[PDB]
Amino acid sequence: EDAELLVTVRGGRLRGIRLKTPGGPVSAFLGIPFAEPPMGPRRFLPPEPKQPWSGVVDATTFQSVCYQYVDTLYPGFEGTEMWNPNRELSEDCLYLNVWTPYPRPTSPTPVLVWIYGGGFYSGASSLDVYDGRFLVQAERTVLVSMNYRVGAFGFLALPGSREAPGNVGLLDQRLALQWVQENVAAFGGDPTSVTLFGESAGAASVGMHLLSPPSRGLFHRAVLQSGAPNGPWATVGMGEARRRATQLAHLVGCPPNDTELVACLRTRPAQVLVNHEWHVLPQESVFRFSFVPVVDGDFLSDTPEALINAGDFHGLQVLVGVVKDEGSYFLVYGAPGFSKDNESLISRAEFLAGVRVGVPQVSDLAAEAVVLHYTDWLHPEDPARLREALSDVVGDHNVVCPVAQLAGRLAAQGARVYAYVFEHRASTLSWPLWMGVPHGYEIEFIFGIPLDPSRNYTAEEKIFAQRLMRYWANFARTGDPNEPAPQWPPYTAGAQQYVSLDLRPLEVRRGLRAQACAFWNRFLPKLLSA
Amino acid sequence: REDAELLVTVRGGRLRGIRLKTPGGPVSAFLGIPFAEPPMGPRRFLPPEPKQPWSGVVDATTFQSVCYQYVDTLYPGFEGTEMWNPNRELSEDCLYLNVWTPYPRPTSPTPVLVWIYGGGFYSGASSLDVYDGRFLVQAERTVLVSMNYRVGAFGFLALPGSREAPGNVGLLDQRLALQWVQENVAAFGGDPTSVTLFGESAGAASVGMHLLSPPSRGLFHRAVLQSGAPNGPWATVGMGEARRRATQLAHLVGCPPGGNDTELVACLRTRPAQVLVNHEWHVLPQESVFRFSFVPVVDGDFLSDTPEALINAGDFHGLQVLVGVVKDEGSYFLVYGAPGFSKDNESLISRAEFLAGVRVGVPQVSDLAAEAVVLHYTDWLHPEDPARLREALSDVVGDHNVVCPVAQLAGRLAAQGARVYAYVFEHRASTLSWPLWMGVPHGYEIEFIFGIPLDPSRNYTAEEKIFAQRLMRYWANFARTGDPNEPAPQWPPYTAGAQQYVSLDLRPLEVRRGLRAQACAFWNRFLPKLLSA
């Protein structure tokens, strides 16, 4: 029996497993329960701390994936299946995972906490691309990841009600962070040095923990990759959240009293809720999600945009960034004329139709303003330019400009901000070439997946992965990604400097789509208000 | 005794002209031909009545008076502004036209160019040195005609619906002159079946309005619009705001001591011309540049609809048009109001002055509209660079008032049956007195079209003289054939798709695409939708 794999946390004793990496072994503790199972009468409720157990919990394998939709658009295609659940679905899914060096550190080691994305409707800490073993070995950190409830199970809200208060998926996240403060030292982690990082909706979650004071005392630094809490998709108002909750009840046969409605919802099998999620959205769209964080004055006392504009952020360091082609990948899920299997060279009619799906629920004037800004009026009908322009519409509106607004406001209000654009297209990427560097495909390099010898990454790509892990770990340890080489300067509201990340050395550039984002961040909001 | 070449009989009676020397030889000039009864006293604000026939010989031997108008005094003595000021006495007796013809007079019918001067509809005169027709006629053997038309309140004060001041009488002055050309130009050797209108700024807007007014449209065959268009935001006014401006002007001068229109105009008729001129600008609703108090009114008569509606719903098959602008249309207007601008310093403005200048350059729009403008003309990587802000504000005024109205006209006319040719004039004259940051200012291609560099008393470059000759041939080729090209780089027609135009400078012709297409898409396609919602 290996004493390195035995740990006592506050709930009781755990048994881990030793794993192999190309650089040596690490210790993993997978499937640690941090909450009571949110089942039966506990569905839709805030999580409760896991009650202590006797005996030894087997922490040698990943636990169940929270109930969620499973993408079936390209069945068997590696580009989509890499994001689908790789374990059984269950409502009993509130488990977290700890990777540490082997033997376990005996000095307080910086902690990285990963929050997966997936539009608040999907995701799992057990996916291959989130394997913490390489970061922990290469950079000598403790890495924690948790499962949190998605879809209606995590974000169905009847605001004002006690039976479905909303944001419980975020509270699952907060509870795991409290678990880390109380327990991570038992694994050799330093609770006074916790860096949150997440991608997409995970980045938005990180941003929301930055703006919720009860969360702010649980971590020290933040990394937001391709997501932001001020995204048009990341939050929903109380009125619309109530409408969506009520509509889903009607769709699954529950008439239409909040108490009656949640009680009837709790009798439905989880899969039934999943099957009807999607039909509560008001219009055809891409990059919008049914059940997302609700601004009800509690977890978020105001909208993230209002909280960002009014916040003092001195003493905060954040790392934020984007991939080169944020929108390209969302277009195959609803923009007319698009497909992974052809060049998606669309007509102007399809482009104009794509703008309404990509910018849903706005006035015709707002839509025409988008068309004006993203049309080259010397080549208004060129299919290649139109495909690229629609990809830029979706990417700028949902990712690049929300991230750029966040970066600019925090920098100008006291935070030290580092910005990147990930510009390397993996040699193993199965998506077509016209998609460029699609959303989500920097994660595998951050986690050091290319070091896995059973994968087909090149030698320079492995070096690149090691470069990225060092930047991320430098930031986690000091608030500065630079090795203490061409220096990575902080992002500021004036100079707007960022670096491009690829196989070539660092190149400093100015402006995160400055011209496009002035439209989304400065003008379009005022058009909608008047 | 008498030179038979300088004696002509038109319908009103006999005329005596003058023989002018040019660098290339003799030209016959008939200057100051009366074409209307003097619009004075009881005829103030009325449409022009045709000139009654006369006995004996009228001496048409010098330029007649300039129509009463404001005289610019911003830079007194500065030639850059004095060249546009009246060079004859001011008078309400000013409805005279000028005819230049080859010496000897042509024996076969000769194409006719008719010039309409600009000046924001408040100023201008056919007698300005820069409009001297002797060089075009000598170089290209055409007949050139120019007329005076009433400006300011005298030409465009409108109490719509009233008979005592119907408005647009300045445009009727132009129309009467065009009717005179049809009835009389053959007596000078001109061909009334080949008349080409050309004009600049408000003259270009005037030319476009004659295109859109059926009674005028039968009086000419081709059109040249230089740095102006009838659909410009400054070129027309609605009936209500025209009535408000007329009523306020009357109130400012003492009329009435105004319900009844007859009575109010009668009181206006007793006021000295200069007093009307002195108060004319006080009726503008706001502090602005490129906006003019009294301008053509859309009242259903001369223009049955707005020029933009008539342009869109018009069939222009069989019509040839030549349109263009200078490289820096807006820079010249900024020293007349924009904060921080002057011809005597570099006018490197701050961001606050840029934002203040936008409201002056784009007057009377919602704050939302103003901020759409700020968004499109800000470089968000260099939001406060003074030199970039100076150029941005110049582009705002130039795009909004000239380039984009011209581009919209060129595009709609091309797509609806007209053959269009477009240019951008990019030569900065060696004799230019305005500062270097202004580039090629508004109005400073005219002297090259009229061949002014060929005057030996002026110190133009020898290369600029060749340039002038090249431009006069383009214009005259268009007047003769509807095509500026010679019967050598080809000047392609402008179309709504390819949007090709040529650059005019000392270099050979260069074909380019798009008359500030991205900018004009904002002014021509989006901004009107915002002003509606």
Ligand SMILES: *[C@@H]1O[C@H](CO[C@@H]2O[C@@H](C)[C@@H](O)[C@@H](O)[C@@H]2O)[C@@H](O[C@@H]2O[C@H](CO)[C@@H](O)[C@H](O)[C@H]2NC(C)=O)[C@H](O)[C@H]1NC(C)=O
């Ligand atoms: C690119 O593909 C889209 C999607 O069509 C599907 O995928 C193709 C690869 C092929 O397998 C098709 O048979 C599939 O239907 C095309 O858009 C569709 O076009 C068809 C007409 O053939 C039409 O009936 C569908 O409604 C269209 N659907 C969408 C979402 O646009 C598109 O035309 C292709 N572009 C090309 C070939 O240039």
Ligand SMILES: *[C@@H]1O[C@H](CO[C@@H]2O[C@@H](C)[C@@H](O)[C@@H](O)[C@@H]2O)[C@@H](O[C@@H]2O[C@H](CO)[C@@H](O)[C@H](O)[C@H]2NC(C)=O)[C@H](O)[C@H]1NC(C)=O
């Ligand atoms: C550039 O000049 C403008 C115009 O001012 C006039 O011309 C100058 C050369 C100088 O002789 C001034 O005294 C003239 O009045 C300047 O803008 C003016 O500034 C003064 C005082 O600062 C102010 O009272 C006026 O209202 C301003 N006029 C306008 C139209 O804004 C400007 O400051 C000069 N810029 C420099 C010198 O950098």
Ligand SMILES: NC(=O)c1cc[n+](COC[n+]2ccccc2/C=N/O)cc1
């Ligand atoms: N619960 C659902 O029914 C459901 C279905 C589909 N989607 C989204 O489609 C899957 N998807 C998967 C991967 C990338 C994008 C997308 C679409 N985004 O709008 C969300 C929820």
Ligand SMILES: NC(=O)c1cc[n+](COC[n+]2ccccc2/C=N/O)cc1
């Ligand atoms: N009738 C008048 O009093 C009057 C006063 C001022 N202006 C304008 O003169 C300024 N100005 C003079 C020359 C060229 C442009 C400009 C400005 N245009 O906005 C016209 C008429």
Ligand SMILES: *[C@@H]1O[C@H](CO)[C@@H](O)[C@H](O)[C@H]1NC(C)=O
């Ligand atoms: C330049 O022009 C002026 C007037 O246009 C003239 O008096 C002068 O002789 C010319 N030449 C020189 C060298 O100044």
